Design a protein around this ligand. Structure first.
Ligand SMILES: Cc1c(CO)cnn1-c1ccc(F)cc1
Ligand SMILES: Cc1c(CO)cnn1-c1ccc(F)cc1
Ligand SMILES: [Cl-]
Ligand SMILES: [Cl-]
Lengths: 133, 136
């Protein structure tokens, strides 16, 4: 469905990246976060939920989801907790050299993934949500 | 254009917030950034451009836009360089005491601003409708 996202973590250069995939489109939002903690996870989810209609998020149900913080953020935002990601690392690989900081490379990779084309993932998410509306 | 954004800075609690407004819809993306520098501005603009189809930005043309970095990032992403602050601040003010960290309060405020229905469509619904229409 249109409001359904998957949230996973992935690790590079000793750092933690959260990757959110909009399941129907393949569109991705990803960011390096300071640590894999409830507080940083909640922050990431709140950010995502303000930008797209997030109804449900499928997660790995690990340690950073057992605490009060993520529960509180999902409650507040009205979110239920109920192939793109190796590719993301591959693109980061292709572009790593052009950026000093991993965080920059991550955002270049997100850009490339979402714009690649007859439809890009970015066009697909928009069409799907507009149709739902 | 569907692809036109305005980028402004605003300041609270000794911290810098960049606010991007999609002009046709009133949809906002905003984040606290470490400092108002070319490098952090470039980073913010690359993030935005990967999430929405950014063709042109209108900025204040100040110091963080004179350097090689923002110019290089905009080149790369194919971006041309050619009320909210207050409203967003008001919502932040309203929620500030519910979050420890300003950064959290900012993202709650963005959520509220983008979902608010004054009657009706929210800004979030409008941006999606406008861009979907343009695509078709
Ligand atoms: C701007 C662009 C390209 C080429 O830059 C490929 N997909 N998109 C895109 C991405 C997201 C949209 F909402 C609409 C279009
Ligand atoms: C989920 C929601 C609300 C709350 O019902 C208000 N606007 N939106 C919204 C925001 C962005 C969209 F693309 C679609 C809908
Ligand atoms: Cl995780
Ligand atoms: Cl600025």
């Amino acid at each position: 469905s249109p409001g359904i996202w998957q949230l996973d973590c992935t690790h590079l250069e000793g750092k933690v990246i959260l990757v959110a995939v909009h399941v129907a489109s393949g569109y991705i939002e990803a960011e390096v976060i300071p640590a894999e903690t409830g507080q940083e996870t909640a922050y990431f989810l709140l950010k995502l939920a303000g930008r797209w209609p997030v109804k449900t998020v499928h997660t790995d149900n690990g340690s950073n989801f057992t605490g009060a913080t993520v529960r509180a953020a999902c409650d507040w935002a009205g979110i239920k907790q109920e192939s793109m990601n190796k590719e993301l690392k591959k693109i980061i690989g292709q572009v790593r050299d052009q950026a000093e900081h991993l965080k920059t490379a991550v955002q270049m990779a997100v850009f490339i993934h979402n714009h690649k084309r007859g439809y890009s993932a970015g066009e697909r998410i928009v069409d799907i949500i507009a149709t739902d509306i």
